[PDB]
Amino acid sequence: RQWALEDFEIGRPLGKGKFGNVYLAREKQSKFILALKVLFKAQLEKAGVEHQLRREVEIQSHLRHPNILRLYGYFHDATRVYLILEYAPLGTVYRELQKLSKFDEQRTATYITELANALSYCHSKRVIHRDIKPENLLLGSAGELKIADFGWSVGTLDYLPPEMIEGDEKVDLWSLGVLCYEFLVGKPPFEANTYQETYKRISRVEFTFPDFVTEGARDLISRLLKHNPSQRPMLREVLEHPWITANSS
Ligand SMILES: Cc1cc(Nc2nn(-c3ccccc3)c(=O)c3ccccc23)n[nH]1
């Protein structure tokens, strides 16, 4: 099942970063619409990440969920590596946040639910996820979120938990807590103007709520951000949280 660049017609650039950009694309024979991520080989080895990709790509190919961006395949040429990805027409959650400035309780609880489910499923197969950033969350035709990052295994540093910065399976609860906060407030709880300050805030778990955040949200968010991984809830507990069940679609 080997793919080549001439198998596709390349469309408008969807976005860029660091290794390569992403293009809209259509497979010539089937007319199937998808996203083609282009990564430059040279730029990858020079990060010592080339092997990291191989394992993540292998992992992703085996993940099937409605809230996880699908990976159809990959290939390479002399120069570069190409990932064939599901196309998400409504863009990132990051950009939606920039446009709206903050989400209401109903949108937040829905996204958190979709995330929680996607993470449950991963755990079902002994796949655990790293930090999750809004830049890596896409939106499907129906506005359903999709985790688009390759960040599995079997963010510097707004989304990283204390465990990862000081020196799992609980990381993802921490991630939901950061996202849940960011969705309602408009910026992540540990934001600072320098790496050094952010590091301090995360390690101390030092954050405050604006007045408009309701009691229910505060309760869920405060449960998820705990320096100690073992004090964090199960994904199951999150899905049943009264603020969640009341606000979620
Ligand atoms: C991998 C993928 C992307 C995508 N759709 C989109 N991707 N990205 C994007 C932005 C920055 C970096 C990478 C992607 C977009 O800005 C975007 C904007 C509007 C509609 C769709 C997309 N569908 N599938």
Side-chain angles (χ1 to χ4, degrees), residues 1-167 169-249:
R1 304 309 324 133
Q2 293 177 335
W3 287 113
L5 193 53
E6 85 244 24
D7 282 307
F8 312 89
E9 306 186 312
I10 317 309
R12 81 156 167 105
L14 298 174
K16 324 170 165 176
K18 164 61 182 177
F19 304 94
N21 315 45
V22 184
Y23 296 92
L24 188 66
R26 181 177 65 83
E27 194 275 321
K28 288 163 164 233
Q29 293 177 335
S30 66
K31 289 193 250 136
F32 190 97
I33 279 275
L34 46 79
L36 177 63
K37 184 174 189 113
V38 185
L39 307 134
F40 199 69
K41 282 175 167 183
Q43 293 177 335
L44 291 169
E45 289 157 20
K46 276 243 140 177
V49 295
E50 188 174 77
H51 178 263
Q52 197 149 294
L53 180 65
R54 162 167 284 87
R55 300 324 217 220
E56 280 175 316
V57 170
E58 155 78 341
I59 303 162
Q60 273 249 20
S61 72
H62 296 325
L63 307 179
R64 299 239 279 122
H65 191 115
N67 303 300
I68 304 181
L69 195 76
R70 180 87 183 282
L71 172 67
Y72 297 126
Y74 52 87
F75 59 93
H76 294 83
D77 54 1
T79 59
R80 53 205 54 182
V81 177
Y82 302 90
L83 306 179
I84 308 165
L85 293 171
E86 169 178 351
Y87 159 55
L90 279 46
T92 74
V93 172
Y94 180 90
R95 177 67 193 150
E96 184 189 11
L97 208 35
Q98 274 181 352
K99 298 191 190 225
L100 273 57
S101 297
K102 31 151 185 164
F103 300 156
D104 61 26
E105 292 187 298
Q106 286 69 51
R107 190 187 297 276
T108 295
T110 302
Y111 283 164
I112 289 305
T113 297
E114 307 180 43
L115 279 158
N117 292 155
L119 294 169
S120 305
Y121 159 88
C122 283
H123 288 163
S124 295
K125 38 210 310 168
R126 282 187 196 263
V127 175
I128 291 164
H129 196 111
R130 277 194 54 171
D131 67 327
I132 304 162
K133 315 179 184 40
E135 306 91 84
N136 293 333
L137 304 177
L138 293 170
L139 296 170
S141 58
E144 76 270 21
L145 81 68
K146 312 250 191 177
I147 299 163
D149 82 337
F150 290 10
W152 322 98
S153 53
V154 49
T156 170
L157 310 127
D158 281 308
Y159 309 94
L160 292 173
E163 310 92 69
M164 286 187 65
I165 71 176
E166 297 172 348
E169 183 186 334
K170 285 294 188 169
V171 280
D172 295 321
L173 282 288
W174 176 275
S175 292
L176 288 177
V178 172
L179 293 171
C180 185
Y181 179 107
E182 178 159 10
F183 289 169
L184 302 166
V185 188
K187 56 193 190 294
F190 313 106
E191 206 181 55
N193 263 333
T194 75
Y195 177 103
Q196 290 85 346
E197 298 162 35
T198 297
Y199 181 104
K200 267 160 59 167
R201 301 243 267 128
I202 287 173
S203 177
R204 299 168 181 187
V205 192
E206 173 190 340
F207 75 87
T208 57
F209 300 102
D211 280 336
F212 60 85
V213 176
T214 76
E215 185 221 60
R218 292 175 190 238
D219 184 272
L220 170 62
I221 293 160
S222 298
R223 290 181 189 272
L224 292 159
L225 301 171
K226 286 284 187 183
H227 190 277
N228 192 31
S230 63
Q231 297 185 209
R232 288 169 210 160
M234 304 297 174
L235 288 169
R236 293 182 183 174
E237 294 164 71
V238 177
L239 286 159
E240 301 170 36
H241 191 101
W243 178 88
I244 284 306
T245 58
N247 301 275
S248 187
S249 300

